[PDB]
Symmetry: D3
Subunit: 156 residues, 6 copies
């Protein structure tokens, strides 16, 4: 059984993430969305809200499951009995930076990384930027799934 882990902070999940989830889900037997803890960076939502927002936006994906990660991505991936990561890429800069982590991840663990190009529509969409805009009152509603919008309309 083929499989890939999609790691990230998903704080919050965006239509950009959901496109990746779908695209990954179309090509692997299982996909595991791994929500990584950052103990240094406090963020807008906590895990329960995070998982919940991913679960609500991915109901149409049976082979996909959501799960909290800790420690080294590669350790998490291997603990899923998988050997592959799937990440989106918006630009060549992202690639130059993801490249190093991917080559490190192969070196230490035999875990490979597959990259998908962002969808043209959402290429400018990122969690941090959507937050800041939303904080300052801008309408980011067309860039996020409704589960996320409802919860934002609660943090007004």
């Amino acid at each position: 059984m083929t499989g890939a882990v999609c790691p990230g902070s998903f704080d919050p999940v965006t239509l950009g993430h959901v496109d990746i989830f779908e695209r990954a889900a179309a090509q692997f037997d299982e996909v595991v969305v791994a929500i990584l803890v950052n103990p240094a960076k406090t963020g807008m939502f906590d895990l329960d809200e995070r998982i919940a927002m991913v679960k609500e936006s991915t109901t149409h994906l049976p082979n996909l499951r959501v799960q909290v990660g800790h420690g080294l991505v590669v350790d998490f991936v291997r603990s899923c009995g998988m050997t592959a990561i799937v990440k989106g890429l918006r630009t060549g800069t992202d690639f130059e930076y993801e490249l190093q982590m991917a080559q490190m991840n192969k070196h230490i663990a035999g875990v490979d990384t597959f990259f998908v190009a962002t969808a043209p529509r959402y290429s400018f969409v990122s969690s941090s930027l959507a937050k800041e805009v939303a904080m300052l009152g801008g309408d980011v509603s067309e860039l996020l799934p409704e589960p996320v919008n409802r919860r934002l309309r609660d943090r007004l």
Copy 2:
């Protein structure tokens, strides 16, 4: 039932190629190496020399098959009953070019593309560069597989 295509000219196959082959064969049920026809320009090796070279270097990959394509990659992909292309990336610049190709392929045919970062040790290997060096007497034997080295000796 999971499957990816690796399109390219493989004129000739390199260790870089073989690496992508292995890496895709490990994650998909089926891999199809697609040797693509270009009219301008004609290669150094002929279509059958290329299939032979690809077959000869992939004997350890039982889920891997080699076919020859004409026309759009997506037409070729759709015709294998597959919806997914796999390619290696050397640099951020490669990515920016392939990103345009990838999105255009997805738009016209729902065919997605998965990218895989070069292995550190072959990041400089490309077939055009290896050929240029071999024509002028440089030893590229450690960058190509034995089947290829063989065919190259008989052009000294």
Copy 3:
């Protein structure tokens, strides 16, 4: 009295082009689309087919005019009584190439260049890529304007 020129081959105009046109026409009193002659190589469409295509897609832009240029863009620009070029950019790589052109144009003629980021939805559209796909039977109709789609049908 504020004016910019959009130089290019527009062989043929795409929705990407039209987007830049609109975006420049909104910010300058006058926009001049400059169809530039290249000897090597000859296009797919002929000079008058290109003007027709540009006129036909810009009927909603009253401050926009189309002229044909030969030679250096800066000579053409200076001759419209203008000091400013406007171009779209797809990627960081586009920028690095155009940056050299821009600075060289400013040095030799005091002509400046204003760059405008591609619209997300057309970031993959270029005329050469659209042509390549159309020659091989892919549907690019959603990336080009109706006047162009029309002329393309009559080459199937």
Copy 4:
């Protein structure tokens, strides 16, 4: 009446900024230099000194005015009755990064962004780097307008 807002922190303004100011001022009816507040990042000068340094360096630009911005750039721009931003770009990396903000800024507000390539002379000039060098005793005097130099010769 055409117009563009030049936003930044201008702490302090550099000959790099002044070139942009001039170049923008040559193509729009009005230009508004917007000095953005960062409540997180304390910096070398405060607003009054900032505005003053810009005002002293831009006396030769009648259509230009200087003004403090708050909140979302796009909200500021719209409050000036304008629909355009003008930013300098030094490299393809800057572009990849400015691209996302620009596409976001169009999405949420219809505000467009125009980019100008830095002048070859000042391509390495940036406020933060000039500060650090000046802090550590290096002579950055040829990279900053005299209004800024005099004030630095006061912070020795």
Copy 5:
């Protein structure tokens, strides 16, 4: 007598650094590894351990010496009676960023900078990334000289 300074934090030195050291040492009369103090960023090792780790890994390099730097790299270089810096580059992004510092360093001090491309083997190797992996239990032993490994096997 020709010479170049190799500045960095070397916390800790990697096989990536050692390749650079060697390559620099092969082309200049002397090389001075300059270990720069960052008073803001606390790091894993302190200077004595840092110098010691470099000294133990560079015994085979007679023309090379190790030394603590303070203040402006260019001031340090000039204090060695040298006029050149040598740095490794992994990617085009690094280059775009090192370019600005190098052009600044020429401007203020006539100090030039030479760049060497990383070795394919170690292209993904960096001190910070090796630390994090090692912190989290990954085996980075093949990416660091034995002097560094022994000391890491002490911080378990």
Copy 6:
């Protein structure tokens, strides 16, 4: 006994070139400018015109010599009793291309490459671009040295 080679076509030499020459001549005991033969394509200037141009612009560089190379640069380099190539870099993109070349040269011949960032003032100068502009009547005289300007006048 320290030495570097500067390979290139120098068709013709520019101020950019001369800058690299000076910068290398300041740091190595010997510099060899290597004018490399290309069959496709033939230049604007002939091999002896190029040597003359390089000699005429480097009279102030006593440790600099000009030879003509055929074949691989590394063969030419090894034959000067040298192990080092020196090249200028304009952009991150230049770097990514030259990085492949550099690593391939090191692999096949132990020949290393040192890169030097363009001087700000000539960052846009390349010989192909200067030629294109001169053919169409633009004044490139401030970007090339007098010996070259001379030979160009006699092609107006």
